[PDB]
Amino acid sequence: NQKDWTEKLQAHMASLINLYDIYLNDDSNLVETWMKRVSAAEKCNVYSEAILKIDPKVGTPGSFGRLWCSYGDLYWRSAISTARELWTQSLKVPYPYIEDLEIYLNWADRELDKEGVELEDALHVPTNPEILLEKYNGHRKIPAQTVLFNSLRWSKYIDYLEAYCPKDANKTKMAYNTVIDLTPAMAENFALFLQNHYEVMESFQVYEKTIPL
Amino acid sequence: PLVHHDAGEFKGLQRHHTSAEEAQKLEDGKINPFTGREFTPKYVDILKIRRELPVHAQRDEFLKLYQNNQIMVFVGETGSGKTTQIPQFVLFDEMPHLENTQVACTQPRRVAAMSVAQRVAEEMDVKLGEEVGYSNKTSNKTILKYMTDGMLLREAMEDHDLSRYSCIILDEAHERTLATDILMGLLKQVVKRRPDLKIIIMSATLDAEKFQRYFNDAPLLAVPYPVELYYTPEFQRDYLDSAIRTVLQIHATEEAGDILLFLTGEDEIEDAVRKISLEGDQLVREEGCGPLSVYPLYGSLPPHQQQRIFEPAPESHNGRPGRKVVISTNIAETSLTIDGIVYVVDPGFSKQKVYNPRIRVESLLVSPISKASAQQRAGRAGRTRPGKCFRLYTEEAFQKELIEQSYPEILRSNLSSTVLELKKLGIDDLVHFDFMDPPAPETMMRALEELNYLACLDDEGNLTPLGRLASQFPLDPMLAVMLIGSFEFQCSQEILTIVAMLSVPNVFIRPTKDKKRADDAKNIFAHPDGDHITLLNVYHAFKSDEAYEYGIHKWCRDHYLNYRSLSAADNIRSQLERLMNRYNLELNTTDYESPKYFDNIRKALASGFFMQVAKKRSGAKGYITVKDNQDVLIHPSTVLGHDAEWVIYNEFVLTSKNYIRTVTSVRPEWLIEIAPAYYDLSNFQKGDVKLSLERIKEKVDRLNELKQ
RNA sequence: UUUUUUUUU
Numbered sequence A: 001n002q003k004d005w006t007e008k009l010q011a012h013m014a015s016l017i018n019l020y021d022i023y024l025n026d027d028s029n030l031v032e033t034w035m036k037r038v039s040a041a042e043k044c045n046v047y048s049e050a051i052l053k054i055d056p057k058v059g060t061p062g063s064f065g066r067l068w069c070s071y072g073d074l075y076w077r078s079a080i081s082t083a084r085e086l087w088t089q090s091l092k093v094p095y096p097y098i099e100d101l102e103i104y105l106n107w108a109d110r111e112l113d114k115e116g117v118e119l120e121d122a123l124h125v126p127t128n129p130e131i132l133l134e135k136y137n138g139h140r141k142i143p144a145q146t147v148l149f150n151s152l153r154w155s156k157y158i159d160y161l162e163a164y165c166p167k168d169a170n171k172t173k174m175a176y177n178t179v180i181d182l183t184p185a186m187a188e189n190f191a192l193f194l195q196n197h198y199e200v201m202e203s204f205q206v207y208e209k210t211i212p213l
Numbered sequence B: 001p002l003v004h005h006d007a008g009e010f011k012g013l014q015r016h017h018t019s020a021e022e023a024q025k026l027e028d029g030k031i032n033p034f035t036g037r038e039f040t041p042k043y044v045d046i047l048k049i050r051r052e053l054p055v056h057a058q059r060d061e062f063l064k065l066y067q068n069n070q071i072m073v074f075v076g077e078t079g080s081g082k083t084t085q086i087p088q089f090v091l092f093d094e095m096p097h098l099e100n101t102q103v104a105c106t107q108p109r110r111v112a113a114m115s116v117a118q119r120v121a122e123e124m125d126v127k128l129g130e131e132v133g134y135s136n137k138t139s140n141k142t143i144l145k146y147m148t149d150g151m152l153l154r155e156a157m158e159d160h161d162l163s164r165y166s167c168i169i170l171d172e173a174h175e176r177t178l179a180t181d182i183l184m185g186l187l188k189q190v191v192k193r194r195p196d197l198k199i200i201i202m203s204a205t206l207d208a209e210k211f212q213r214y215f216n217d218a219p220l221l222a223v224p225y226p227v228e229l230y231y232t233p234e235f236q237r238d239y240l241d242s243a244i245r246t247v248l249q250i251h252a253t254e255e256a257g258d259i260l261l262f263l264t265g266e267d268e269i270e271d272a273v274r275k276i277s278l279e280g281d282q283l284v285r286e287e288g289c290g291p292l293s294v295y296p297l298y299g300s301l302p303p304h305q306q307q308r309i310f311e312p313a314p315e316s317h318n319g320r321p322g323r324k325v326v327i328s329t330n331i332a333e334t335s336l337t338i339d340g341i342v343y344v345v346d347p348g349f350s351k352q353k354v355y356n357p358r359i360r361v362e363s364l365l366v367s368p369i370s371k372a373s374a375q376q377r378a379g380r381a382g383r384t385r386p387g388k389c390f391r392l393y394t395e396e397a398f399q400k401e402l403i404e405q406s407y408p409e410i411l412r413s414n415l416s417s418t419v420l421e422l423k424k425l426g427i428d429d430l431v432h433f434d435f436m437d438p439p440a441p442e443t444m445m446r447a448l449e450e451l452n453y454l455a456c457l458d459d460e461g462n463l464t465p466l467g468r469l470a471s472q473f474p475l476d477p478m479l480a481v482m483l484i485g486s487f488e489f490q491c492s493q494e495i496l497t498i499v500a501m502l503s504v505p506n507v508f509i510r511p512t513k514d515k516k517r518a519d520d521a522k523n524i525f526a527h528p529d530g531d532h533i534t535l536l537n538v539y540h541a542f543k544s545d546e547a548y549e550y551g552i553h554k555w556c557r558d559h560y561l562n563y564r565s566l567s568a569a570d571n572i573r574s575q576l577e578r579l580m581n582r583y584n585l586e587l588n589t590t591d592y593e594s595p596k597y598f599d600n601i602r603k604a605l606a607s608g609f610f611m612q613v614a615k616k617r618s619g620a621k622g623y624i625t626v627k628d629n630q631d632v633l634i635h636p637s638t639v640l641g642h643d644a645e646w647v648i649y650n651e652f653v654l655t656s657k658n659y660i661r662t663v664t665s666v667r668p669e670w671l672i673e674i675a676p677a678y679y680d681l682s683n684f685q686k687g688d689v690k691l692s693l694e695r696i697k698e699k700v701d702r703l704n705e706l707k708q
Numbered sequence C: 001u002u003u004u005u006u007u008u009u
Helices: A002-013 A016-025 A028-037 A041-054 A059-076 A081-092 A094-099 A104-116 A120-134 A138-151 A157-168 A172-180 A184-196 A201-210 B020-027 B041-050 B056-066 B082-093 B110-123 B149-158 B178-193 B208-214 B239-252 B266-286 B303-310 B371-379 B395-401 B418-425 B441-453 B465-470 B477-489 B492-502 B515-525 B531-542 B545-550 B563-582 B596-608 B668-674 B689-707
Strands: B071-076 B102-107 B132-134 B144-148 B165-170 B198-203 B220-223 B227-231 B258-262 B292-297 B323-328 B341-346 B349-356 B361-368 B387-391 B613-616 B623-625 B631-634 B646-654 B658-665
Touching (some): A002 A016, A041 A059, A041 A081, A041 B515, A081 A104, A094 A104, A120 A157, A138 A157, A172 A184, A184 A201, B020 B082, B041 B110, B056 B071, B056 B220, B071 B208, B082 B144, B082 B165, B102 B149, B110 B144, B178 B418, B239 B258, B239 B266, B239 B323, B266 B292, B266 B323, B341 B371, B361 B646, B371 B387, B418 B441, B465 B477, B477 B492, B477 B596, B492 B563, B492 B596, B515 B531, B531 B545, B531 B563, B531 B596, B531 B658, B596 B646, B668 B689
Parallel strands (some): B071 B198, B071 B220, B102 B144, B102 B165, B227 B387, B292 B323, B631 B658
Antiparallel strands (some): B613 B623, B613 B646, B646 B658
16 A cells, blocks of 8 residues: 555656556546546546536536636647637536526636637637627627627638628628628628618629629 | 136036137137136127137137147247137136146247236236236236246246146247257156146247157147348348448338338447438438438337337328338347338348357357348238338349358357256256257367356266256356355345346447547446446445435436346346345345455455456557457456456457456456366466466465465 | 347236
8 A cells, every 4th residue: 555655656746657556556446537637638628527517516616627627628729619619618607607696797708718719719709699699788799799800800700700790680781891802692692681671773783793703 | 726716617528628619609608717707898809809810710720639649839920819829729628727737838038928918818808917927927826827938947947847737838939048948858858757748839930840850740730911022133242331222222212111121230220320311311302302210229229219110100291201211130030010111121141149169158240141030031021011122132142142040049159057057957968968959069068167167066067056056046157156155255235236237238328429428427436446346336326315316217317327227137136136035145245444345346256257357468468368368358348447467357249359348357366266276277278478477476375375 | 449139026
């Protein structure tokens, strides 16, 4: 047991050899998987965070631990689905916080961390905007996504614009033309908008502007 | 003693001379011939229904054979009313209540016996568990007794001549199960001792020649929609792609009706399911094909998920024929009627058991099916409506390439148990013993060797108290010996639980698309150095008050666990506990606070599974088995994340590689202590990786003894 | 990365 303790202290001083020492010693096992934690990977950090969330009476402790886990896993991320799940989960923590009445401000903070992250991130902005509109402040969030796209005033950001202009409709005309400065389906769609508003002749003009291209 | 009606309306006939007319005259009566009850309208309707069954039209003839022959064979179409009507015919000819005897009908399944007991109980207008019953609902008034072959085998083990029965019926003898064959072999001698016994052999399909020739030229009674057969002109290079493409083809072109596809394993089946689902959806979307519903079907599924195949075909909004595709193993190959199935797709492959006498081990291998099996698979259709069967092989292959009829299980399976049971029957010279089909002497000798090391058979060849005790249990001899020796390590309850958990299919649920959360949920119950210990934790958590306060089934559906497997395990554990209490085995356990807890459990495990031990290659990759010296690896579903160089395993499985399933770390010292007979250095081959450090452990032991 | 079958209210 003492030599195993030396194997443990050596593990603290530290790969698999410590685990072999653990087998030589063979709650300590869960402690050992925890040691593996002490050493897709970030996704595993998320899945374990999910099972821990299932295990979450100090749920707040497991959640804050998930936050510090975000602080550690962020180093591993040097991003899309990692950052995306990271945002969806953080906002989910502020969502369970919202259920706890514990949340939108901290959600704005984690979303600010998403701003600190460095198109899936645009999905994150789309998410903060999504709950933000689900929150009962529709225009206020649109002003923010607009703050981002205006911040882009690049070409890659335009796919996010199609991600944004698609719901920015619910005036929008110039917002749409900004795309023309920088996709036929998009064109026919927009002309269909004006047709729905029955601008008619203006709509025909759009087809003039498409075909010159 | 059996309670019965004294009768009197039965008198007027010489024994064994009952005609059909008299029986029918008793049937149409307002009063029951065997009980004092009056007949219900339900009985009238059911009688009207069953009187039109094909087996009834031959009743007279059946009687005329059964009266003049001691042993007879019976073959009829599927669902003609064999299992239900034949024993009643027997009841009408015999005098079971007058001569104070029972009549036994044997089913190879529990559910079979139970269900048919229900149906027949409703047919004879008796309450289930009274005069007609299954075993157990059998009381002292029970005349018609449905039972598994194992139960009849037990009653045969307690009473050699089976004096309680005057007529014994074995249905579905085409499966040739262990208990069935043993029972036939016994009955062949019982008929020599007592001529008052009659034996009936029933099956829907059979190679009746073997049965007739075995029972000394026994008589055979054979009682009488088109299914079209399609063969491929050429050979199909990849049977899987051929299967998928052909199923999609039947979906796109052929007439209305459901499709039944046979495949190999659950992995292959899942792959085929998701592929056929995807391309099927694409077919509906782009080529305007009808809606398609694919359902998987294999043994490891819960009974509900198995029942899911009988769901109606998908509704159609577009007008295109919506249909259902049932992807199954050979579980639906024999005796099963699905209403919607019209088409049957057969690649001609299955997974069968292969045994190597040199290694003395059994594994599973993909093999070509048999002619009989093909006729069965093709016979699944053409019941509700005319069927069409697409076989993915040439007719020339059917005539030549395909085996005549599936090799018997006894000639394949490890006996290791068969020998023990034969010895319990009282057979001394098994080599000289009269089988219908004698097994391989190599396998026999190795089995006797295993039982010799397990101390079930002494050096002389007779049964030890350990063998005589372990024979009564429904377990594999190793599991048995382990369970018996358990209470000496003061942990018999835990070992009992572990055995029960090993006797049930895989508990853990692992979704294809959600592996992480399932693996975490398993890691919660996971225990270092032991899969068995982990299983014990799982059952101990399932039987916990907390899990009952949550929602048990909900709790199982929250921790990624199979409720069916867990409840089945609880049941098995109850049975084994009852048996332990019957043969007087102490239920003993130790505190978790005691550090010798896990060690006791491990030791008790080694007591029965010392022959199945693996050692990791010193300074290399992979493991190697002590027995027969085979290179092996640890199964991916094993908890042990660290390299324990000495392990005890439960299952040997062949798939992508030679894998070892369900393990637990052990000390070689314990192994030497428990089974010195098998672990003497003299037994094993020259200097190999195992022996080299085993001898080091020996040097260690001898130094320990030297210092004292 | 790979559970064919079965194992008494």
